[PDB]
Design a protein around this ligand. Structure first.
Ligand SMILES: [Mn+2]
Ligand SMILES: [Mn+2]
Ligand SMILES: [Mn+2]
Length: 385
């Protein structure tokens, strides 16, 4: 089938086709930034690298614009971390904002108003999914992608997250988390519940229960700790045949997985994803619905160095919130607070601090660099006062 949109890098980078090829160098790993002569809304800074060489395309995508919800002005920043291809990421980065605009036009003025714009976003994500499900048949939309977006609507920042990217606010050196990551660990109980009530999704290969280690057949009938979908701690249970299957949810942290395949549990796409060497679908245990978090901009007067950082797992997998905050409060004093390439250079710094430098034959931050794609938005919160 033909692609739905041609693969590329975020539009606002204004790249020629040859420049895109020139950026896909797994060796050089150029850290593409926004041009001096191309300004983004709020003077937002963006920086970007390609993987170390695990996939020939940069499967991260991003886009941002000022949209107009009329029967009006809504700032939009988006970050999509694609996997198993680039179709989802590209499509979502071109059409989600339109799904946002539409779902907003329906509520453009005893339910608080913020609950309608939240509901607008969760409805929007659901219709970006679906559209990817129908057009999957007529277009090549490969893989899936995590989606993290923020809109600005009437002085409130809505950060909607569906994936493992992360958005934090640094306000006077204080880090304010504006998203939470969605993993088998943070979301075990939603999954185990679904395995129990809809057992055919486990299909006699997975148990909805969870055990502290791999359950051997020599322990068949022994007492052993387990965790159930409505449990937080652990209890014993006489191991009983069915518990020899592979555990639906297993691992610890960046080790945790659902059905030994995927480590992130929300996002878009992946309608066809099945377990390795199985006919078992995966998308049931997934959710396109984001968690929206709100930030009222008028409740505080922002300096020049009070930023909103959006990055994909490529950054947060190697650097800590703290580490990021430090490196950003330490970089911005270097640039004239009136300079607008400021934040583009802050982003480029973050990317550099995570990409690393190619040592003997590896990338090193004597800690190791990041080999995932890295995309970083540094949004200045002064432009919202
Ligand atoms: Mn990816
Ligand atoms: Mn990740
Ligand atoms: Mn990634």
């Amino acid at each position: 089938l033909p692609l739905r949109f041609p693969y590329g890098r975020p539009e606002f980078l204004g790249l020629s086709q040859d420049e895109v090829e020139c950026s896909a160098d797994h060796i050089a790993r150029p850290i593409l930034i926004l041009k001096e002569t191309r300004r983004l809304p709020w003077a937002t800074g963006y920086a970007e690298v390609i993987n170390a060489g695990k996939s020939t395309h940069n499967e991260d995508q991003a886009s941002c614009e000022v949209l107009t919800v009329k029967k009006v002005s809504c700032h939009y920043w988006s970050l999509f971390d694609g996997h198993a291809g680039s179709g989802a990421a590209v499509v979502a980065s071109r059409l989600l904002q339109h799904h946002i605009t539409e779902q907003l036009q329906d509520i453009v003025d005893k339910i608080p108003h913020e609950c309608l714009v939240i509901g607008a976003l969760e409805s929007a994500f659901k219709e970006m999914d679906l559209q990817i499900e129908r057009e999957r048949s007529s277009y090549n939309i490969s893989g899936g992608c995590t989606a993290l977006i923020v809109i600005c609507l009437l002085g409130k920042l809505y950060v909607a997250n569906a994936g493992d990217s992360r958005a934090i606010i640094i306000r006077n050196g204080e880090i304010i988390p504006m998203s939470r990551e969605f993993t088998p660990e943070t979301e075990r109980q939603r999954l185990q519940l679904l395995g129990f009530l809809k057992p055919e999704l486990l299909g006699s290969e997975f148990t909805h229960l969870e055990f502290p280690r791999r359950v051997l057949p020599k322990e068949l009938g022994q007492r052993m700790l387990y965790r159930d979908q409505n449990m937080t701690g652990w209890a014993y249970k006489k191991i009983e045949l069915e518990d020899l299957r592979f555990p639906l949810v297993c691992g610890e942290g960046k080790k945790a997985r659902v059905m030994a395949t995927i480590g992130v549990t929300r996002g878009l796409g992946d309608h066809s994803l099945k377990v390795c060497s199985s006919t078992l679908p995966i998308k049931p245990f997934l959710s396109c619905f984001p968690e929206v978090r709100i930030y009222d901009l008028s409740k505080y007067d922002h300096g020049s160095d009070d930023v909103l950082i959006l990055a994909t797992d490529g950054l947060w997998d190697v650097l800590s919130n703290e580490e990021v905050a430090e490196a950003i409060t330490q970089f911005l004093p270097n640039c004239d607070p009136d300079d607008p390439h400021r934040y583009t250079l802050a982003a480029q710094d973050l990317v550099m601090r995570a990409r690393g430098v190619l040592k003997d034959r590896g990338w090193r931050i004597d800690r190791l660099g990041s080999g995932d794609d890295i995309s970083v938005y540094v949004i200045p919160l002064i432009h919202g006062n």
